[model samples]
Target chain A: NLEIGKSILAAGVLTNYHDVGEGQPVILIHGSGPGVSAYANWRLTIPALSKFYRVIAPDMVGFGFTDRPENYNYSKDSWVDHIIGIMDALEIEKAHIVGNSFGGGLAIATALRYSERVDRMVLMGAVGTRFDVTEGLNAVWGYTPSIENMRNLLDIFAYDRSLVTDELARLRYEASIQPGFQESFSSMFPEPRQRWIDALASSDEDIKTLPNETLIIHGREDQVVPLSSSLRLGELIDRAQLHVFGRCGHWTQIEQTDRFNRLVVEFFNEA
Target chain B: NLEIGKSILAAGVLTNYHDVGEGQPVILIHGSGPGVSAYANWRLTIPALSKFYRVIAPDMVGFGFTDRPENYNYSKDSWVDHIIGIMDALEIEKAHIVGNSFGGGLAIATALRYSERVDRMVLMGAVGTRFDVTEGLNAVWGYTPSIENMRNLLDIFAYDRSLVTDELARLRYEASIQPGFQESFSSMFPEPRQRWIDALASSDEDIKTLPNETLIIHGREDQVVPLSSSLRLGELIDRAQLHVFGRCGHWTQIEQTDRFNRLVVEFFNEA
Candidate 1:
């Protein structure tokens, strides 16, 4: 793993991330899952992308090894602000954003909130748009935090079943049981799942305000966010292009690593 | 020119087509437009793809140089049958089908009806799924056959404004005024647009029955067939993938020529 770096946001909340390479800045935002950290989601992507882009994969406020300020309001606005704060601290005037799942929502939010700071966006199985609670999402939130459940969730998260290995499940399970990890996950995603999860979504009207060129990449078999979500995003967002990978699920970066990397890099490199 | 080949179907209908290249058989189905012929749409795509694929671009029954028999039924099923007849006459067992707009619907119908005879499909701004009549569609049908109107329609068809040149408009206008051409167009697309158009769409149940690997490509800015149509097609058809082009209008072949060609070639080439 690249040396873990830390940045203190204006709010004094320390944000942990992996910053490498040197060129046009491209920030990678990790998704929300049991024990999901920036490194966990973007390890495979950062190294390859860093060669051409200054890659910054950060752990948003509550998740990962980042600090979880007591009683922090875990919502879309908070996530966007945390990202903006990171950009400000790093002195990055503008950069491309690549967000996955929940991070995808945050990326869009950031673009809508701070359009000037975002040049372009790549959303992978993003979860900003409204969609019915999928079986995959239900499974993720309903889990009681066990290794078997984690493994099962990983299986649900992927179309290629072989990718959910025992070692990976063990790592995720171990991480989930970490101090404040479970509490953070619970707080960010409360029970009676409908209320909080739906609140997390950026409305249809708000997304239309984004003027940046956006690339929406979704797995055809993505259950968590549903393929229709990306389809709707493509429809609502004027400057959006969509790419759906067959035999791929919500975790596109892991399920189709090479193709995913190539798409993101190519999109970023485009004029 | 591929020698401008001709064939006679089982029903004694003479079919005209452009057949070139040598390898796997790949049929190119053209879309609907004022005075549109298969050659008009596939001229660019056919030559490029013929190098590796056995490209067969046919002028469907009522369009182009193809036979426009009196009182011929102009519906989705009729088009599907005519295509099947073409396959049978050619003595080909099975082949890949590539369709554009109206032809896209034809390809899907063919796959649904003649499953064994079809291998795979590439749908470019395909129409078969149900949708409200867009402003672009209204513009196309609302035109009053004139040089000015034809030029205006061409502008709507392309994302590249420069493509709507005087020569192209003049040529289309010339072909549009052909004897029986306007009559054929009027018959194929009847009045009360919503009723007839929706009747032509393949039902969700029927589309779900399709068993071929399908590639759905649409221009993000396609006014004629909104990107949502392709999105819904991707959702309905099993083993379907979607690729949308930004800054592209209804005509993908003309607007994003190189990328469209590459995507189709690569997708068709994949095992």
Candidate 2:
């Protein structure tokens, strides 16, 4: 029914998530936009992934139906805490983490700080490595309300232009205008947006020595985050592997869901 | 750059085609709709298939830039005749065939009558196995050119709703209204559409004994052609193997382009 699958108080904050399937836990963190949620990002993923691992698609602090306290301070630390807190609250001692874009940045922060918490990690169209602020990201972060703005944003999300339908734009546009949605979205990234990109970054030395077995994935044509970002991660993280898709843009999960899920499942099974 | 890739004379009629790569030849056959073409149906397929095998995508008689003789009778035989004519003219003694929907029916006839001219074959979202005329195919054949109608038609093509964009529908709408495009499309299957379904079909007896190593691909959620059609073929054909993609619809080649091409190409490469 609703994408707000289940609500649980994690570290005293009400977190929204979808938990399905059986076996070892795999946490799914969603990418950001005005109205993105775990369900929105992981809709295709949940059905496919749930057939194997226990998929926890969470709407972390300040996102989705999760409690967003007014004037809430948002940071990679807060985000990661909220995530692991979900793990703690649920008695999940450890789990696999997969993140997208901003979620990927937070994922790196988690893997770096909470090393023992993650078994294996998948960084998809991620934004952990240092790179210039892209127009696509800026458009997503600096988004204002309107169907047209949403249409413009959706256009860059996939390499296939046909996927950006008027109806889809309308849905995203409506999502953004939800009572408190824009306030939280606008609060996350203000002008001088390059600051947030750096805030999300981890030093090369820190990434290179990271011990987690990582699967790095990116779109060769991703406009929101550069391909060089993953290439750098693949090079730096000695324990990491990379996969890149051609003719694909920012929406890797949506653009290439079949292969994406299959790849992730296979990687997870490489025990 | 244009979808109308190239042109040639096929049995005295000028036919449009896209010929790329270099190896043993593979022929791509396009399905029928208001404004579909070899390029439209196989846009993603061409690049993928062309890399490993020589790819020939031809807009058959009554389609694309191919000469549509005024008042020409359209039947599986005429369509198969044009295809064989292309092979004869090009001096291709044997080739692999990948067909979509209506094209698949023609491919069946081609494989049946000219078995000596084919190596391996793939029927994708095909119509050769008999079934009731689906609402999706009826809508497609009964289309009156308009952005709205095109949008309605496209919504059924893919299970992913967002992929049906306004611009895409507009493109197809305009393509259909082109001089003679609608006239030829309408002539192929008139209001009494069940006749065309039967006209395009072959018998279970014929399908069971066909002696080509064949691969059958279909989308489980395909609205235009029921999955039972392929399921039936898979069961009947002693030499056939089937693969059905979950959450996919009528547009298997478009909706699952990566896996579809890889599956076909890999199947073609096998000895």
Candidate 3:
């Protein structure tokens, strides 16, 4: 539970990440949303995973406390490169990767692009699969920076309404008001950009190239990334297993924290 | 574990079933196939589930040691009634139901029609959702009771080829040679029949009326009944949860036996 720190990585970008634990390296990738950061997403996960493996939860280049350049060009490949750069900065060769939502997409892209660096992976409510724009996507991208809007978006993120606390919604609202946060958020998920932001729509052919043993988890009632997305990914990836939680929504890692933690550790520790 | 026994129930049908353990009543229903029976399908599941629940695995009307009348008109409703009659004979006022394939469809149909008798349900690779017939279905129905055909059908039914043992195939072959097994089998899944046998298709509206909480499990690579069938059922069943296993096929209870048993018991025990 160390304070988030920054490392000047490739291209002089200051990457903010939380590094802890003593065993194998495991990267925790957070998803996209207005005011979302690695800490907010991985607060519960990092400490739990740290007990078994060294967990590296990083704020992607444009999100959280990470640097957001004025002319930063974002795409799937670039994000993959950025994550690899973070790995290079950390001086680690290979690590088990766990991703959620947009981070799930990033994890798949990283595994596909840099195979040698990924031992195994877990994708939760991932977005690498191609799908039509959904109401969840609309709510996430259509934010206008209001407290009410933040509450509405958080409501959509979780299946359990009790988990969406006033403090949680206010924290996200405060993050939205960060200097360069809104700038990157709006530009990335622009109204006209309906499909995935990068050329990373994991096609049937693309998924065939994935060589890692992966775990695909989704909420049965997930609205943001429909359960079908993971269903199709499970079909495409050769060595993948899917475990779906009922009465769960987009934020599976948070909503089902204990079950999620146990499942992930058990999967990573399996022979 | 106690041995399986036969009992004369309603309609003078001799029903073969395994009734063991003592606690909350839980019925196990077998799927459709040439030589399949309640024992063969649930040998691994029965004892494991019995530890927590009073497990009951039964051979349906036309298959296994269950009475198969020459004039018996096998339909989804008839099968449902027969199962209800078994509960009636056993004086099970209300019990949890676990069904596979055809049995899964029967579980949902029972929940929809006789809600009072069903406490909850777990449908694995269920055939209630309307889906087009596949080669797997054709191979199952078109079998002429040869060792090779039984092996082929078993191979098609499982994702792990190792599970398709010769002894298993031989047992099914022996069961196939029973008096009225073939006649009922052909009549149940005819070549031109593109949908489920006897309107077993639990339509979206029909599933909506189901009152019991459900746990829907299926293999991502299931050929006989597509994964979408379970996905659709999870969507329509209000209190339903969907669990999809990858690198797994139509035989979920066999392919992922330990995980399936654990998940089902955990779900059933949930308050």
Task: DockQ each candidate and list the results.
Answer: 0.43, 0.02, 0.47
- Evaluation by DockQ, superior candidate among 2 and 3: 3
Question: Candidate 2 clash total?
Answer: 1
Indicate which candidate wins on lDDT. Answer: 2
lDDT of 1 by residue, B1-271 (tens): 4314665652456888878899999998888787887788888898789999888888888887777987887778888888888878887789999999888888888888888999989988988799998877777766558889899899888887888989988988888878777778766665567765586578999998888888899998888888789878888887887899877899989887876787788778775
lDDT of each: 0.83, 0.85, 0.82
lDDT of 3 by residue, A13-106 (tens): 7888888897899998888889877888888898888998998888888888888877988887888888888888888899999988788888
* Index of the highest-TM-score prediction: 3
The alpha-carbon interface RMSD of model 2 comes to: 14.8
Which lDDT tens digits does candidate 3 get at residues B1-271?
1224656574467888888788899989888888778888888898888898888777788887787876888778898998898888888889999989888989988888888989989999898887877788778877888888999998998888998889978877877887777877777776576755437777777788887788899988788888888888877887776778878989888888877887788777873
Superposed model 2: Cα runs more than 4 Å off: B1-271
Worst 10 residues of 2 chain B by lDDT: B238-247
Candidate 3 CAPRI category = acceptable
Per-residue accuracy of model 1 over A4-26 as CA lDDT, tens digit each: 46656634678888888999999
Score every model by TM-score. Answer: 0.82, 0.53, 0.86
Q: Write the per-residue lDDT of candidate 2 for residues B3-26, one digit (tens) a residue.
A: 687878887778888899999999
Which is better, 1 or 2, measured by DockQ? Answer: 1
Task: Count clashing residue pairs per candidate.
Answer: 0, 1, 0
Once model 3 is optimally superposed onto the true structure by TM-score, how far is the C-alpha of residue B168 displaced, in angstroms? 3.8
In terms of lDDT, model 1 sits at 0.83
Deviation in Å, model 1, residue A258 alpha carbon: 4.8
